[PDB]
Structure formats: C-alpha cells, structure tokens
C-alpha cells in the first residue's frame, strides 16, 4: 500500500491523476522508468503514477 504525497494531474492518458492522500496498490514496478502501474483505492482505476509522488503508507508519520 502507498499514499500520494502531492497532488498530480496526468499529461499522458496512460497515467492517473490524483490528490495528496489518495491511496494506491502497486501492480507493476519491474520496468525501468520513473513510473509504476498502480490502482487507486479511491476510484478503482489503474494507470501509471510517478513513483516519487508516493510512499509506503507505513513510511509516513
């Protein structure tokens, strides 16, 4: 489980938009690149998110 540290608006249609605090389950992080495929626990949509915008839920205060 991961949490959005900041808001993000997608520029590519493969990517999710999200708001600070939204939670995700990571589906794929294997390929090189700054993006992980994730599923929003709020919306149920799947797409890429920037890995640096999120942190494990237990790695925040």
């Amino acid at each position: 489980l991961f949490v959005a540290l900041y808001d993000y608006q997608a520029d590519r249609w493969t990517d999710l938009s999200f708001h600070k605090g939204e939670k995700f389950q990571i589906l794929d992080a294997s390929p090189p690149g700054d993006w992980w495929e994730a599923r929003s626990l709020t919306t149920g949509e799947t797409g890429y998110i920037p890995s640096n915008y999120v942190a494990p839920v237990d790695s925040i205060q």
Binding site: R12, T14, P31, P32, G33, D34, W35, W36, E37, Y48
Partner: peptide
C-alpha cells in the same frame, strides 16, 4: 513477451 527495453518514462 514484453519488449526487454520497455521503459515507463519514455514509453
């Protein structure tokens, strides 16, 4: 068989 050089920053 995903292309081995596939990259998510560039796609």
């Amino acid at each position: 068989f995903r292309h081995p050089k596939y990259n998510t920053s560039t796609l």
